[PDB]
Amino acid sequence: VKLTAELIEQAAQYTNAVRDRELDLRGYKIPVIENLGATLDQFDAIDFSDNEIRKLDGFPLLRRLKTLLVNNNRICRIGEGLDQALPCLTELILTNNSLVELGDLDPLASLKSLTYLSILRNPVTNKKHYRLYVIYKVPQVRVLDFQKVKLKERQEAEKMFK
């Protein structure tokens, strides 16, 4: 089913558990990721669980948002233009997807303000020194996989991949 703004104008943007402005895409299976700016700068968290989104891309220029929930999707690639469209985001829960390669984390450094993300239940995790690469290419992040970043992981992230 094509992803349009009927499921946006009917979707709920409300005061979420963290007291933000969260717009739900629960029960959507939307395979095309576009046309979100119709939130009109009254949103902070975009929850899109149960989406047919094969990738993480197609986001408009949104200025003040804080969190993007891509849970239960089919993410194969990672699109590069993330921070120029979401400059003030801090949380990305893109866990339970088809992440495998270290190059699937390539845009992950563009976020200056990224602090919290979740990429669990993704095959990119069984890779050795994976959180090392994550806290390496991402220095600003502190909350990594339900565990705060630390000087040990930081020194090990700066040491390897020299």
Added chain:
Amino acid sequence: METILEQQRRYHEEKERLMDVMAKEMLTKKSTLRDQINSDHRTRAMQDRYMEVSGNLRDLYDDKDGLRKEELNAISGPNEFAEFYNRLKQIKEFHRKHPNEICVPMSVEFEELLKARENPSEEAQNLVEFTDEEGYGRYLDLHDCYLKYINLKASEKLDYITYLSIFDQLFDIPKERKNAEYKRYLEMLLEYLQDYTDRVKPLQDQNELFGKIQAEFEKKWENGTFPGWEERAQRLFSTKGKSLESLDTSLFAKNPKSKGTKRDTERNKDIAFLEAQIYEYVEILGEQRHLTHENVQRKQARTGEEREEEEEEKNLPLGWDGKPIPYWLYKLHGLNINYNCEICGNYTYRGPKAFQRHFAEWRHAHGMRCLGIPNTAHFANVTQIEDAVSLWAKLKLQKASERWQPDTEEEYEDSSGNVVNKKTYEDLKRQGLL
């Protein structure tokens, strides 16, 4: 990918439709002046479409230059013919009709019923392009220009008529200094005048007219276009005379004239060009600026009601005799008593007879039907919606009891020796077993 056949035919059809749509837009008349300006803008959009097709087609000579030899072969043919037949021998099970090849360009380059709008002409209008101080080509928006000139000059004795006379003359003795920042305000005034002159006519050659004005500024403006009989030639930017043409040729390519001044032939170029463009625009719309001054004077001289209006732009019923009824008859029949019915949309019935008949009349029967309640004698004298819905609950329950649900109440014989509803018995009967 027949770069000469398919592309040539599609472009030819598109350009033909564009020319026909321009012919139709020019053959239809205009009724509101905004309608005329919007028709001009739509004709500009259609001509732009035809020109874009023309430019897309004018480059189609790099593959045509290679295909001119192979397209003219009298020996080849049916081989590639049968090959294309095999490629087009895919499944034609798409049992559907579609006239959307050439009837679609007609609906894209056409007009509309609530407003004359084409396919690309659905969002183009004079609403974001015409000013309400003008009206899409009625008046001029120059109040901002008067406020800006007054803020630049700092004078409390500056009226609109004196400003308009200073701005209307073609090359007269200025009121503000050209080496001052009022030339900056003249730059914005020239920009606004050029934007108004261009938005007044989207059909006239914009590139060609700008090119003619630029050639004029290059060849006839900076070469003594206003001659004399120092008075023989004057400089437009530097404000210096020339004794003769040789003196002017010596004083244009000199050292002080080029960059030895803030009013030299290097710095004052954009200012002189904007001033010449503003003068040319005033001369081209000298009747238009004059009509705008006419509207401003009419607003300043009219009365206040006209200024606002210009800115904003017996006791008894009839009978079969044909005359009213005696007032005692009106009272005797109770026609002075009003009865309201909520089910009838709060309609007021006059007198007891009309209010008794209305329970059988279409208006009450329709109100009952909208509530999902059958209009029956049980609802006689019910006027409130809440009473009708309630009464309905009890009546539904009662008819519920008197009616006998056979399947819901019948008792059937379980073969072991049990009793269960006939509906369950038949269901289970089939239900693998019973």
Added chain:
Amino acid sequence: SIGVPIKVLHEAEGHIVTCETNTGEVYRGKLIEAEDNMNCQMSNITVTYRDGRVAQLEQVYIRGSKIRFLILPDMLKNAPMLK
């Protein structure tokens, strides 16, 4: 007549509110007593004095003139006024 905002404040009395005064005084506490002049006398309030040095006082009383803001109980979202 009576302002529906002031009715929301009177429905916001007895429970925890959070006023914010003109000098930035943020007083989050039990709004004991309020009147038509918005004069909010509250108890066990946490008054932050705009400094981030937030202290806890009891029987505080801020007038209505300084009230830049006042967070009332959001549990009054179904109050009979708005509906």
Added chain:
Amino acid sequence: AHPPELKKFMDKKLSLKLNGGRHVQGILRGFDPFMNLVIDECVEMATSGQQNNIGMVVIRGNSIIMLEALERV
């Protein structure tokens, strides 16, 4: 025009905040609906550590931002 609900505060010491960064302690003694408060044994403590007792004051509601009660009343 309704007078304020300040009667339980009467005959009690409060620590009030008047505008301009003024803070004084004072005895709530009487007023009008205009919230003009009568503070007996009033002592004003300035922005510095020094404090000057002014004793008996009639203070405007136009400067007073709020007041805490030093007793439970």
Added chain:
Amino acid sequence: SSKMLQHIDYRMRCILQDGRIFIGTFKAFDKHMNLILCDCDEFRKIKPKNSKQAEREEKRVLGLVLLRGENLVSMTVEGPPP
């Protein structure tokens, strides 16, 4: 007429007297038009103090906030009825 009721029930950014904003769904108004906002957040500017530090806007949570008539300057509609 009591116009703002034609903008009632929807999300508006209401202006304060000190330069900030409060984004909340308007409930209703009064004679002095004082505000009661449901689901309200406050957008407050954070001073850069430098040309090398950027200007940010920090947001507070209020919810049901009774903004006294001393705050209302101008109010825009920012989100549809929820």
Added chain:
Amino acid sequence: MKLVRFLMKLSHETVTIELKNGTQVHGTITGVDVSMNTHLKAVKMTLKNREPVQLETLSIRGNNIRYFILPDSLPLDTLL
């Protein structure tokens, strides 16, 4: 007679009011009151040290307006 009654003689009048919050706010206001409540539409609002941002619907009060400006070809006599 107060001139709030004169300003009440306005609806769809292209005005530029300078509000007390360092703002220049221009538009064809919707409807005015006796307390000078001037509610704007198609509003171009620029604050003190701010951009000419756009508001689709705004309701500006009276005590927050420091100056007003009516259009150019407007009769003050039978507007007051």
Added chain:
Amino acid sequence: SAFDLDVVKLTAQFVARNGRQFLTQLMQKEQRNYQFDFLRPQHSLFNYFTKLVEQYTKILIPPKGLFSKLKKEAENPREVLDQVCYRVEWAKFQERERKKEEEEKE
């Protein structure tokens, strides 16, 4: 009838390259054991094939885009306006002549 439209366009294009009324790729393509059911003049689709051939032959003229460039209609809203006014005037004259003919018929 999209496959039929493709076939009609292909017939017009492949007849654009023939040399005479009998010298084309369709004269023998009819008897070449492949169904060509539009070339018959009793089928009204022969008019559609002839219109496709007319369009191909009007685009394969020297001004159709073979070795020349169209510049008066391609950057000339003045020439476009002259042509549109001439088409509207020819339409008005055609309607006026038609009205004269209709008055004659009445």
Added chain:
Amino acid sequence: PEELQKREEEEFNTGPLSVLTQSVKNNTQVLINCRNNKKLLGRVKAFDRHCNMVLENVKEMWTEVPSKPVNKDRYISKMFLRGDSVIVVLRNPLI
């Protein structure tokens, strides 16, 4: 009513609003000191008890420091200025 409007006219003609009285009788220009040092030079079109000031031929000036303060000005001919921002309204300015 009638006599009450007449008492209002008496207050405006022989009270402290004599500046507005002259400005509306002989059509003189008054310098209005706005609360933020905005100097307004122009005649007064109508006035009220609350000093709501509708004015014609107005110019608004201030000193904007970009340092040395330079005298920024604008010329707003017609203007309505309610009596809220007025610090003083001076009937005869020297210029």
Added chain:
RNA sequence: GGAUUUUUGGAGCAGGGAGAUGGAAUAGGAGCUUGCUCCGUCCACUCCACGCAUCGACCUGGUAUUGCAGUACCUCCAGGAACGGUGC
């Protein structure tokens, strides 16, 4: 229905000094471009009084809590100060 709590406003204004410190690719004047010489707007670093003190989140480890409930805000030491606003 402009005189102490809401709509005729108490608002507005300006970021402490200085050293042969540094930029203004496209925008300063004047010494009648380029080069040099001075003056009226910023930041980045050093110095003086990191403008000071505060508390509030925050980051680095260690450190104590296994605990059923509707919330300003909750363990302790420590340092750096990336942030908030309060008196001078």
